[PDB]
Design a binder for this molecule. Structure first.
Ligand code: HEM
Ligand code: HEM
Lengths: 145, 145
């Protein structure tokens, strides 16, 4: 359950999420676009869900892709800001899941974002410890799908 | 059309938006719920779009309503952060409009949020000067609906 998954966010996991977000969230446009372009590069099968975005290979030059990428980063900002209160984190995650459930995005499908997150983290000198912390946060969302 | 509306965001307007957001955005849960519940209080008919939230009369205690209210504030955070780059502001506004267009929310309907914003600003001692600046930001979104 989402309530059980949220309880897995221990003290050090929360701390590692904040420390890495301080850097990653500093450039939402740049890191947001890097995150999603990596998703399409490593998992081309997911491109089908983004027909509305057009030619995603254009990257930053694609206004729709840039708009989506910047916006995605504010969902992550929301999650990080709610780490202090489990009740608020859960209600924001459930709210976030609504549209993804309607698009038939499964937990397994959503989990494909872990790879891209690990790579972006590594590009900023944040290793496995941080990738694992982020996988824990992603797992809270997966529990809601 | 959206670019034209964005042109109304003059230097002075952006300054008032940033200055008032420094306060309003410091308590996203509190002010987001105040904003949302005021919308329902002044325009009861808007509740028709929120059947999924359940018993909205519960206010803050309603987890779904609270989740939506907090999340709403990050869309505004996004807009405020993109004020200095029209190209980015426009793409984030158009991205934001997609789901609202699908919900058949007209520009006129969306404009009903102006009253609630004026009241929330006033509760923090921000006068008409600030309410007018916010109405101009809302107008950018209206141009995309
Ligand atoms: C860290 C992970 C992710 C975050 C933070 C995220 C965030 C968002 C946000 C904020 C929106 C806009 C609001 C909405 O329409 O729900 C959105 C839209 C969307 N997301 Fe997610 N998402 C993530 C991963 C994914 C994945 C892995 C898929 C599918 C494989 C997915 C598919 C979609 C689609 C198709 C849209 C609509 C795009 C459009 O037409 O503009 N998302 N997502
Ligand atoms: C400045 C004001 C507003 C902001 C910043 C805002 C923001 C948001 C955000 C970020 C979402 C989640 C993503 C999505 O599904 O699109 C959302 C959902 C929604 N918004 Fe807007 N919105 C605003 C005003 C309105 C108004 C005036 C209406 C209708 C009278 C409206 C109706 C909806 C509905 C029905 C949902 C889905 C709620 C749910 O089932 O969870 N929004 N809005």
């Amino acid at each position: 359950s989402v309530y059980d998954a949220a309880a897995q966010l221990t003290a050090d996991v929360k701390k590692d999420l904040r420390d890495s977000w301080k850097v990653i969230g500093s450039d939402k446009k740049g890191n947001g676009v890097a995150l999603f372009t990596t998703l399409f590069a490593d998992n081309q099968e997911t491109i089908g869900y983004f027909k509305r975005l057009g030619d995603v290979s254009q990257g930053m030059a694609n206004d729709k892709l840039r708009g989506h990428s910047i916006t995605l980063m504010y969902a992550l900002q929301n999650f990080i800001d709610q780490l202090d209160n489990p009740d608020d984190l859960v209600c924001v995650v459930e709210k976030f899941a609504v549209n993804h459930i309607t698009r038939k995005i499964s937990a397994a499908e959503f989990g494909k974002i872990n790879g891209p997150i690990k790579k972006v983290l590594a590009s900023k000198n944040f290793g496995d410890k941080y990738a694992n912390a982020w996988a824990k946060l992603v797992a809270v969302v997966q529990a809601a799908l």
